[PDB]
Structure formats: structure tokens, C-alpha cells
Design a protein around this ligand. Structure first.
Ligand SMILES: Nc1ncnc2c1ncn2[C@@H]1O[C@H](COP(=O)(O)OP(=O)(O)O)[C@@H](O)[C@H]1O
Ligand SMILES: Nc1ncnc2c1ncn2[C@@H]1O[C@H](COP(=O)(O)OP(=O)(O)O)[C@@H](O)[C@H]1O
Ligand SMILES: [Cl-]
Ligand SMILES: [Mg+2]
Ligand SMILES: [Mg+2]
Ligand SMILES: [Mg+2]
Lengths: 231, 232
């Protein structure tokens, strides 16, 4: 069992992580009002409408009625309305869903941000090693694991005491981070592990964990997607 | 009579203008909640807390208890709380207020944006001409100050009360201020809206100080009202 993206990000934020949970909408009218109100804070910003379905590959999926993509960029609130109007109440078809598709009754409206880097990061219970493990890589490709095992970084975690600052500071630099982003990444991975541990999750997968710019061009770590499984 | 900044900006937005109306808060704890929720949309963004008082010179004013400035930048929601806690329910002192100061019971919480240029633009009822006029300049200097030290810097545009501003009048004023590319048409559309506010609301003055060119979170350049004053 999994929980939706926006709920997963809210749980991450609750434990100190930085994640763009946006705001959930159950109608295109509401999605429009969300984008419209956001223009009070950052006028002229663009928007991203993300179908909230329990399935992966939304960006490269397509809707039964023709529209392409479960993650679509929008320039205005009215564009947000049109896009949301094609998602809410319709069936999306991705790789993970096959031809049966998956129904959608809600989307996530968020602001478009400038993305500098995209990382992968997951936390799971590794039976072979008998402990939790943090997997991460800087590649954009399981594909990257077979064509480049050097690209994957696996960090075994003390089943009792959890991660250490040394483990995380190294994982941050192993991914190419320096300056203030090192501690920022450390703090975020700490929060993600607390989610995994304290919520008895079977997997916490951030695909992508990104380096983004703030409206004033400050570089920060932020979860741009999130999947958390249970039971 | 004038109306507060955020009310003026909401009116501009209603008529098609772009203005950072932010969101008003009537308590410090609400100001924090607004900033915190904004981190759901643009995580890591900074914030600006702007005292909502019927007086000018907030940026260089000071509060009866020590804090400096009616428009202060904040890095986190908790900083927004601390700042708002000193503004809401306290007295601000600026040039226009003297030593008696003015009371503040609400603030505007906005996201911090990158400002590239700041213009002045006003629309006032000219009695010698018997029609409205648009005054604007790109200089950073008081407005009457720049007028006396450089009257060539100021651009005056009489407006036909029957046809409103013309596309020709506005395209020139935009380029006279140094705008090119998409900002020209953008500025035209915004000044049109500003006149509709002035005309349809029977205003005595619509003053945008500053009318700015800002970056969006994705670095697109757009015209935006960063302040607003509307009299009656
Ligand atoms: N707020 C955003 N602004 C801009 N691009 C975004 C934003 N959020 C996500 N993206 C981009 O959209 C892509 C697809 O979104 P994602 O949440 O990964 O869905 P999925 O993995 O199902 O395709 C991401 O890999 C990222 O590059
Ligand atoms: N969202 C913002 N982000 C960054 N700077 C801002 C923002 N809004 C306003 N400012 C800056 O703060 C200054 C003071 O604010 P303003 O609204 O002009 O108040 P006042 O002119 O009454 O002192 C503006 O001239 C502008 O340079
Ligand atoms: Cl945070
Ligand atoms: Mg993803
Ligand atoms: Mg001003
Ligand atoms: Mg920028």
C-alpha cells in the first residue's frame, strides 16, 4: 500500500524535510483558484499540474481521451483549469498501469521552479544485508545500476541507532554537493529516515530529489516527488 | 481618503493588472501560518513583511519600541512571526507621521522577489488641462525632487477621457522608460488596467511607487506593482 505524492510530501515536511507539497484540488475550478491566489505572492509564475494517482510514470503517460502526460506545465490559472479538467474524472495510462489505466479524481497544483540537479534517493529494508539502506545516485536513467554500478551509492544504516552525520556528509559529497547544500542535504536525509523509521514504512522513494532555486535564486534541496509504502 | 496597500493592489488585479497583493494577516500567528504554507509552493523562499498603515515612508521608519523599518525582509516563518509581533498592535514612525507615529493592526506577508528596475507612475486629475495625465519616470530619486532636478526625466502623457490611453501613447512611454521585448506590451497592458482603476473607481490619484520589473521564480521578467496608493 502507498500514499499519494502530496500526502507523502506533507509527511516529509512534518519531519523537517523540504518538499513541494503544493495544494491538492478535486476540481478544475479549485485548481484555477489555487493558481490564481498564488499569483498574489509570485506574480507571473508558471504552474505544474500533477495527477495524484497511485502509479508511476505519470509524466510519460497519456489520458484515455488523448491528452499526453500526467505532469503538465501551465502558464496561467486558466491553463491550469484546462489541464486539470482533462485529468480529474478521467483515466490515466502509464507504464506501471498497462492498458487498464487508473482513475483520477484529484490533482496537485504547484508553482514551477528552476531545477538545477535531479537525484534519486530511496530508503528500504534490505533483506540481503539485514538492515535499512539509503540508495542514491546523480544519474537520470535499476537501469543505472546495471550500466553504471559506480553511480549507485548504498549506505547501510545502524538498525539500532540510525544514520550518522559522517555517513550523510559523505553521501552528500558523493552526489556532488558542496557549500551550504551539504548540510542542507544532510538535514533532509535525516528527516526522510525519520519518516521511514517512525512511520514503519516499507519504502521512502524520492524520485527526483532535486537542487532547486528559490524565487531569489538561492539553491536548496527539495523533494519534487515522493512515494511512501506501508503494510 | 486613501486605502491600504493590499486593498489597492487587489483592485488593480481585478482590472487585469499584475500586483503583489501578498496576503493580509491580522495577527502574528496568522502571519507565520501564511509564510509556512507558502513554503509548500516555493520551498526555501524568503518573505517580506509590510506594515499596513495609512502613511508613507515605511521602509525608513522605525517603531516606538526600537525595531527599524515598516517593510522588513524575513528568512523563515518564525522570523515573520517575530517581525509581525512588533508591528501588529504597535506604533510606526516615519517622515510623514512625525513623532506621534501611526498605529498598525495588520501586515501584508509577501514572498521576496528579485527586483531589476523600479519605476514611478501616477495617474492624476489635471485641472489646468481638464483631463487625466500619466506621469512616470525611471529615476530612483521624492517624485517632486526628480521633477525639479531633472524635469526631462519625467514623462507627461495627457489622456483622452473618451478613448483612454492609446496604444501609441503607451508603447512610447514604455520605451521612454527603457523597456524592450515582451516588457513593452506587458507594460502597456498594465498601464491600461491602472487607468481603468482610475477611471471606473473615480479616483483622484493612482500612484505606483515603485512600478517594478521583477523576475518570476523561473526568471521570466514581468511588470509588477510593488506598491500602490489610491486616493478619493
Ligand atoms: N514544481 C516543478 N516545477 C518544474 N518541474 C517539476 C516540478 N515538479 C516536478 N517537475 C519535473 O517533472 C518531472 C515529472 O514529475 P514526477 O513527480 O517525477 O512524476 P513521475 O515520476 O510520475 O513522472 C520531474 O522529474 C521533474 O523533472
Ligand atoms: N516582494 C518584495 N520583495 C523584495 N523587495 C520588495 C518587495 N516589495 C517591496 N520591496 C521593496 O521594498 C521597498 C519598500 O516598500 P514599499 O511598498 O515601497 O513601501 P513604502 O514606499 O511606503 O516605504 C520597495 O521600494 C521595494 O524596493
Ligand atoms: Cl525546511
Ligand atoms: Mg517521479
Ligand atoms: Mg512605495
Ligand atoms: Mg532569478
Amino acid at each position: 500500500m502507498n500514499i499519494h505524492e502530496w500526502q507523502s510530501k506533507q509527511l516529509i515536511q512534518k519531519y523537517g524535510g523540504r518538499a513541494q507539497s503544493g495544494e491538492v484540488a478535486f476540481s478544475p475550478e479549485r485548481s484555477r483558484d489555487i493558481a490564481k491566489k498564488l499569483w498574489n505572492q509570485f506574480p507571473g509564475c508558471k504552474f505544474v499540474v500533477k495527477a495524484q494517482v497511485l502509479a508511476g510514470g505519470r509524466g510519460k503517460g497519456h489520458w484515455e481521451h488523448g491528452m499526453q502526460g500526467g505532469v503538465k506545465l501551465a502558464k496561467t490559472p486558466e491553463e491550469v483549469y484546462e489541464i486539470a479538467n482533462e485529468m480529474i474524472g478521467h483515466k490515466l495510462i502509464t507504464k506501471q498501469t498497462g492498458a487498464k489505466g487508473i482513475n483520477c479524481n484529484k490533482v496537485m497544483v504547484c508553482g514551477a521552479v528552476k531545477i538545477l540537479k535531479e537525484f534519486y534517493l530511496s530508503i528500504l529494508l534490505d533483506r540481503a544485508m539485514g538492515c535499512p539502506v539509503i540508495i542514491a545516485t546523480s544519474q537520470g536513467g535499476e537501469e543505472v545500476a546495471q550500466k553504471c554500478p559506480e553511480c549507485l551509492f548504498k549506505v547501510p544504516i545502524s538498525v539500532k541507532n540510525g544514520p550518522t552525520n559522517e555517513q550523510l556528509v559523505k553521501l552528500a559529497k558523493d552526489l556532488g554537493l558542496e557549500g551550504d547544500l551539504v548540510q542542507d542535504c544532510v538535514d533532509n536525509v535525516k528527516a526522510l529516515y525519520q519518516v521511514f523509521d517512525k512511520c514503519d514504512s516499507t519504502m521512502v522513494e524520492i524520485n527526483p530529489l532535486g537542487v532547486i532555486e528559490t524565487p531569489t535564486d538561492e539553491k536548496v534541496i527539495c523533494c519534487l516527488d515522493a512515494k511512501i509504502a506501508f503494510d
